[PDB]
Amino acid sequence: SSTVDELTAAFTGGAATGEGGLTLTAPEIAENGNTVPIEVKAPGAVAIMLLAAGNPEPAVATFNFGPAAADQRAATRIRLAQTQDVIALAKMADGSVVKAQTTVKVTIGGC
Amino acid sequence: ADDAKPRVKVPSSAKAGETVTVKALISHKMESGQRKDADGKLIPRSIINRFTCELNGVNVVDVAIDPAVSTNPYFEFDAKVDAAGEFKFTWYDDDGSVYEDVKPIAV
């Protein structure tokens, strides 16, 4: 299958994703593909993984929250080669994963 | 790498138990491996591949970073500040460099 699906399956341990409890924030239109603000939010998650489904190497980042984290929010700036779907995956203590997804328009393609 | 200059914005004090937002950047080209030259040759990847933030010896966040993360990697996240001490920020380069920063916090 696709690279996104292979990374997803490694992250779920072979299980389908679920839904709810995760917010993916990205701009509807990102002016500059080289630097696109992204925020992910998932109360209780042990880890949140970020994938950009239209990039050659779709993996962006995996955020692991330690015990000193006040909450399970992370924000970053990413590269998007062109208009595409951004995917967030949040893994809970029990090992189950939820998926959030949103399409980002990119005016100036990155790179 | 040369000139890997950390930039952290965080409050220097908190109330006991208060959440504080932490913003950490470092200067880095983040050569992604996707860029081509004028000869049309791919330019080899060289990025910072991991960022950690600890508060008083306890992890706040541990980030595994891939080439899609932008030039001058920026991470923002929230710390639960129980007692006075310090944040320690670490960045790992693909080239074997380790960059560190330290920020005090009073409670």
From TrEMBL, chain A:
It comes from the Bacteria. Residues 10-111 form the Ig-like SoxY domain. This is SoxY protein. The gene is soxY. The chain holds residues 28 to 138 of 140 of the full protein.
Automatic annotation (TrEMBL), chain B:
It comes from the Bacteria. Gene3D superfamilies: Immunoglobulins. Pfam families: SoxZ. InterPro entries: Ig-like_fold, Ig_E-set, SoxZ, SoxZ_dom. This is SoxZ protein. It comes from Paracoccus denitrificans. Residues 9-101 form the Sulphur oxidation protein SoxZ domain.
